[PDB]
Amino acid sequence: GMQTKVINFNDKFSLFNQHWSPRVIAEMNDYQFKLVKVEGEFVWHEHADTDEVFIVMEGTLQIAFRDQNITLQAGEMYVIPKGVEHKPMAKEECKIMIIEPR
């Protein structure tokens, strides 16, 4: 049945504990919805050809930009415009969802 394809975020987060390792949970056209557990600092990087979306599901995420840091709480999102250098970070474990093209 179609109900089996209803995705529960909490159920999906329970399946892995590894950090900085996105899990694809759904596809929409040529885009993917990915769950990630993060802690500590990522690296400075950019996506030259696409905007990237961060939705915080649980915890507190920071994203460093060249002149400022932004803070995202649970129930908040941000669109990183294409070509913009950034470095995601989390003081404690943070549960996020990323949406971007395949």
In the complex, the residues that contact its own copies under the rule CB under 8 A are 1-3, 5-10, 26-29, 31, 33, 50-53, 65, 67-68, 70-73, 75-79, 82, 99-101
3-state secondary structure at position 28: strand
Q: Residue 1 Cβ, how far from its own copies at the closest point, in Å?
A: 6
- The smaller minimum CB distance to its own copies, of residues 41 and 51, is found at 51
Query: What phi and psi, each to the nearest 5 degrees, are found at residue 13?
Result: -60, -35
Q: Which 8-state DSSP code applies to residue 6?
A: P
CB count in 10 Å sphere of residue 17? 9
Q: How far is the CB of 33 from its own copies (least distance, A)?
A: 7
Residue 39 beta carbon to its own copies: minimum distance, rounded to whole angstroms: 20
C-alpha to C-alpha distance for 47 and 31, rounded to whole angstroms = 14
In whole angstroms, how close is the CB of 68 to its own copies at the nearest point? 6
The Cα 25–Cα 48 span in angstroms is 24
- CB closer to its own copies, 40 vs 81: 81
